[PDB]
Amino acid sequence: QNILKILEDKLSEVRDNLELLDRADLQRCSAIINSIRSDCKVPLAKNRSSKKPSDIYSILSEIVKSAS
Amino acid sequence: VAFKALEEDDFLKVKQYLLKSESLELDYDQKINLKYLRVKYLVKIGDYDLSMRLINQYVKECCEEVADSNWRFKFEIESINVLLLSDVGIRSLPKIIKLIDEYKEIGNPLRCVILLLKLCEVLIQVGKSMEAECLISCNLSTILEFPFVRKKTDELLESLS
Amino acid sequence: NNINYLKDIQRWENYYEFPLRYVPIFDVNVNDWALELNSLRHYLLNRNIKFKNNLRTRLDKLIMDDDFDLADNLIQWLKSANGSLSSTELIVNALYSKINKFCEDNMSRVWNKRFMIMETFNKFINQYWSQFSKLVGCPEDDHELTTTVFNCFESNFLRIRTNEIFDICVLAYPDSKVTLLELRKIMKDFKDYTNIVTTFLSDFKKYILNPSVTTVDALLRYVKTIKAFLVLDPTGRCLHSITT
Amino acid sequence: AAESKNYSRGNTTSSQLVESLGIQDLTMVELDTLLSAALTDSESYNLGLLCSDKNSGDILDCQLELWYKSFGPH
Amino acid sequence: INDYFIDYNPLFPIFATRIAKGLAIYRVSDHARLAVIPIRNINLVANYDWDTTTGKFLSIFFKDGTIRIHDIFKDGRLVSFLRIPSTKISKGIWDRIPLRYEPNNRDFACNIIDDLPKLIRFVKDSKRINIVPYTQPNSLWRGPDEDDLDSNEKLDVHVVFNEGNDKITVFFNGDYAVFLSVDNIENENSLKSIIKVQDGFYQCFYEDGTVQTLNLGPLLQSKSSVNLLNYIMVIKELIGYMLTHLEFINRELATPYLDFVKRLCDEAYGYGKLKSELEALFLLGEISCDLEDWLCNSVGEKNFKRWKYLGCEAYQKTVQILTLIFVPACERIIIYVEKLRAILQAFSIQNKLSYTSDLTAVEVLLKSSQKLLTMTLNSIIGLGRDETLFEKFFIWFNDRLHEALDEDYKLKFQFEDDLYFGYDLLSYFDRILSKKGTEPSSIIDVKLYRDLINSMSDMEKDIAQSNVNSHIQQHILVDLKTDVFAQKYPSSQINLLDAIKLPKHNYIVYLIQVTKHNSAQEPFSEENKKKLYIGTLKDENLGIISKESSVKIPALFKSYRLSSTRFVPNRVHSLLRDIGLSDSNYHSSYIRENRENDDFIACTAKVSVDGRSASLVFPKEKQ
């Protein structure tokens, strides 16, 4: 595990068999490259955006306003 | 019925149902429940090498095939339970804490409390039950509001005595 | 379990090494005695949380009362121990606390001066920078550390001015006009403006919008803030927000 | 400075909580639980292997913990 | 202004003065009237207290048991009216305690009420029915002040003392009341003054020198206990919140629609004859001479549009109040009682106290509220079917009515659109024209709703009295009355006059009348002198600090009641300068109102307590 922790620092070149690490970007780049060599899942990262709860009437008025 | 049979320790009934599972044509929502039912049954039997290899496969495909977060959590806590039940719960510490602060922002009180019990259960098998009692005492008021965790909560209280 | 303070470990070290002078067993060329000492220090750091917290408080107190020599000995002890409390975090926190208190002592309610942030920074550097560099061990001419220290000084200056902006604009105006123009050089983000107004409304409405206050003085102070913020903000958008 | 900007705009984060609990070291806590009792020979060689690791982290902590268990007060 | 009254606001330069027409408010700087509080009789007012935390409001205590609070800033406008059940008030003190719930990692008690959208009220003006955001009845004087950047929620505690019996009543948040019974009822000692040390810590000083201490500290330091206090207040309010709207639909939506139906049908034609005739009209089209009169003269065009307008609002507005009000409220009742049950169960284990409070009261409320939510959903589905039956009735009734009045109407609607059209049309007749339909509960079962809500409200008072009061009283400690002055003065009968706390200082300044106890062996000594000794006690343990010095009364001032003196803080010297600087009828030499009015003494007793001094005023009540 410590040996792999060392590999979490100096490895930045995409040198195959990335799945045993925990770095997604290197895995995603490897997946992108492996697809191009083959010619394969460009999984887009969903933006986890995040506040007042307001009242019932403000919500209902909002939906009918956006309805039109 | 099978979930009720699992609670009543009717292992013969649930075992025969799981045989039907592998050769039925099931909807996805029905698939996960039987997929989740198989994990809980295997924990009861005692075999954990098969279950551990089985549960992580489920959650991994529960984040790629379908982005179902609710079923990711329920599978995840089962991985915590099988670990700490095998007297090795320390490995779960990075995983549980990552979920605690993540679900604090969400604000779902059930998610926070169930993680507290797993955290408390971990702390009492290390030899540090003193602070676990201190932590459970301060939060005892807010953990009784949830009925289905009361049985696990009450059982833990007699252990501390 | 009986260790709670640094002075305890030093006297125990002297207790252990008392026979060492009378019987030489440790070779000069191998620092063997130091190795187990650092090993025992490392374990004490990584096993006794109460000792770790006491060391934090002791170093914070020592850096607060300007006992620099003992603080340096403590930093040397921590570095030799190589525990999970590295000295880099401690000196950062100690430096941050010291600069905050020095800023609070010096630039509190003083607005007549011009370019006073330079005066404060130079005074602090002449008083403590050589000692701090000795504590860290970095060269005295570390340019980027001085730049970051200056950036923290102006951030502290901004924070203090945001807190005191009500008395700044209501009472000292127009004597505090000069530092208002200097404040104009610093504010760059919309959050800074929204914080400056929401605080200023909060105090003004707290104090001035009392009907128990005479209406003539309320208006006189009000227009005093209007011109003060107008000079501060040429656009006048904050004036519109205040007026509304 | 960046943290203070958010703070201006303490034991509030979970990292301080796990620090307060004194369970920061994963391996040291795990071996402390394992050594609680015994010391079967098959396990003891495995623990000794951990002390004699070619590359690891808090190796000195495990060595002296093993020494405390073997020849400490009891 | 010369008067022995007036209490200065600690936070603003404003005072409350007493005049004949009522309580009056004048700015210190300008001597200009600011507000007038209409009061009938001064004797009924036990005392008035200012707002310590904010100073925007003012409190008035009545002897009969009513508390009235008016804000100064709104020209003395009344803002709230309070009542305490069957309590005789002697002297009350108002305190506002701000709570500080800093975020802690060990606190996993997340809140979801904030998350759930806030409720809305239903209020109908003369023009139409409007809908406004929901505000609690006492939230107007408790809402987060626009002024307070520290908008932390403030606990509102009103402390009430009963005369003649020394009973202590503490009032929380304007709704919940807690009764505390004092053991020392042997002596009927009048309570002289109330001094507040810090938030939730009070010292009571009686005429006999005994000191009684009320401490809110344990209650304030228990996070769950305060939440318990807040929850039981919310549950009672929301139950009445539903009950308020339940009477709204019965009075505004249900009854006006049914009365219009009754007057138009029963008073004109009759029910039993109408139902049979309408079915004959529906099946055969036979319109009798009398019924054609009913269509033309009784109903006509004018009432038909009103009938549709009244009916449509009777159903479409009724479903809105069931879904937008009752369902969100009943869910919120369930969440609160569930939290109510959890808190009591925990302290039944956490304290491990021998006496236990039974939880059957909570369980009954849980099922009753659960019964309501199932029962409201049945109605909403039921009113859904009513709207379908409602519309199909009038689309056909439009056709018959105009045909009777036009003799050339072209029938636009066709019965062939729907196959079961007859069954829905007939089913409406039975609902609207029947013995059960004649009752006002035809639209919804109002009686069942009214009974169920009152069942919960009456039971809700039981849980508060039986369990919540038991828990709050245990966490409330009332220090036994003790004598502190006996150690310094063990052979003197002590008479206490007044005592206050100097702000930013932890010392208690008191004025006492020391009369040495004359034994049965010293006959008729002239040393029965009333000495106005003044000393200092540390606010916490009431420890004597400085040696008391007896103030020498000049012979000219011996004709005044020294017992009626009170403390006057906050720069009384300011008025002395302004009296001579204002061309009023008040002369300072002694502050005298003309040459023909009562003279009141302003004893500016410079009691140098660590370099600072207070001020006193000596009233005139000639013996």
Swiss-Prot record, chain B:
Biological role stated in the UniProt entry: Component of the anaphase promoting complex/cyclosome (APC/C), a cell cycle-regulated E3 ubiquitin-protein ligase complex that controls progression through mitosis and the G1 phase of the cell cycle. The APC/C is thought to confer substrate specificity and, in the presence of ubiquitin-conjugating E2 enzymes, it catalyzes the formation of protein-ubiquitin conjugates that are subsequently degraded by the 26S proteasome.
Record protein name field: Anaphase-promoting complex subunit 5
Top-level taxon in the UniProt lineage: Eukaryota
Transmembrane parts of this sequence: none
Entry's localization field: Nucleus
Subunit-structure text: The APC/C is composed of at least 13 subunits that stay tightly associated throughout the cell cycle: APC1, APC2, APC4, APC5, APC9, APC11, CDC16, CDC23, CDC26, CDC27, DOC1, MND2 and SWM1. APC5 directly interacts with MND2 and SWM1.
UniProt family annotation: Belongs to the APC5 family.
GO CC annotation terms, alphabetical: anaphase-promoting complex; nucleus
GO biological process, one term: cell division
Chief location category: nucleus
Other comments on record: Present with 259 molecules/cell in log phase SD medium.
Keywords of this entry: Cell cycle, Cell division, Mitosis, Nucleus, Ubl conjugation pathway
From Swiss-Prot, chain C:
Name recorded for this polypeptide: Anaphase-promoting complex subunit 2
Quaternary structure, from the entry: The APC/C is composed of at least 13 subunits that stay tightly associated throughout the cell cycle: APC1, APC2, APC4, APC5, APC9, APC11, CDC16, CDC23, CDC26, CDC27, DOC1, MND2 and SWM1. APC2 interacts directly with APC11 thereby anchoring APC11 to the core complex.
Note: Present with 432 molecules/cell in log phase SD medium.
UniProt-annotated location(s): Cytoplasm; Nucleus
Entry function: Component of the anaphase promoting complex/cyclosome (APC/C), a cell cycle-regulated E3 ubiquitin-protein ligase complex that controls progression through mitosis and the G1 phase of the cell cycle. The APC/C is thought to confer substrate specificity and, in the presence of ubiquitin-conjugating E2 enzymes, it catalyzes the formation of protein-ubiquitin conjugates that are subsequently degraded by the 26S proteasome.
Organism domain of life: Eukaryota
Family: Belongs to the cullin family.
UniProtKB/Swiss-Prot annotation, chain D:
Function: Component of the anaphase promoting complex/cyclosome (APC/C), a cell cycle-regulated E3 ubiquitin-protein ligase complex that controls progression through mitosis and the G1 phase of the cell cycle. The APC/C is thought to confer substrate specificity and, in the presence of ubiquitin-conjugating E2 enzymes, it catalyzes the formation of protein-ubiquitin conjugates that are subsequently degraded by the 26S proteasome.
Name of the featured protein: Anaphase-promoting complex subunit 1
Gene name of this polypeptide: APC1
Family: Belongs to the APC1 family.
Organism superkingdom: Eukaryota
Subcellular compartments: Nucleus; Cytoplasm; Cytoplasm, Cytoskeleton, Spindle pole
Residues of the full protein shown: 1662 to 1746 of 1748
Quaternary organization: The APC/C is composed of at least 13 subunits that stay tightly associated throughout the cell cycle: APC1, APC2, APC4, APC5, APC9, APC11, CDC16, CDC23, CDC26, CDC27, DOC1, MND2 and SWM1. APC1 interacts directly with MND2.
Other comments on record: Present with 178 molecules/cell in log phase SD medium.
Curated annotation (Swiss-Prot), chain E:
Cellular component GO terms, alphabetical: anaphase-promoting complex; cytoplasm; nuclear periphery; nucleus
A Pfam family per the record: ANAPC4
Predominant location category: cytoplasm
Pathway terms, separated by semicolons: Protein modification; protein ubiquitination
Keyword Nucleus: yes
GO terms under biological process: anaphase-promoting complex-dependent catabolic process; cell division; protein K11-linked ubiquitination; protein ubiquitination; regulation of meiotic cell cycle; regulation of mitotic cell cycle
Keywords tagged on the record: Cell cycle, Cell division, Cytoplasm, Mitosis, Nucleus, Ubl conjugation pathway
Subcellular location, record wording: Cytoplasm; Nucleus
Role of this protein: Component of the anaphase promoting complex/cyclosome (APC/C), a cell cycle-regulated E3 ubiquitin-protein ligase complex that controls progression through mitosis and the G1 phase of the cell cycle. The APC/C is thought to confer substrate specificity and, in the presence of ubiquitin-conjugating E2 enzymes, it catalyzes the formation of protein-ubiquitin conjugates that are subsequently degraded by the 26S proteasome.
Subunit details: The APC/C is composed of at least 13 subunits that stay tightly associated throughout the cell cycle: APC1, APC2, APC4, APC5, APC9, APC11, CDC16, CDC23, CDC26, CDC27, DOC1, MND2 and SWM1.
Miscellaneous comment in the UniProt entry for this protein: Present with 1332 molecules/cell in log phase SD medium.
Name of the featured protein: Anaphase-promoting complex subunit 4
Organism of origin: Saccharomyces cerevisiae (strain ATCC 204508 / S288c)
Lineage summary: Eukaryota, Fungi, Dikarya, Ascomycota, Saccharomycotina
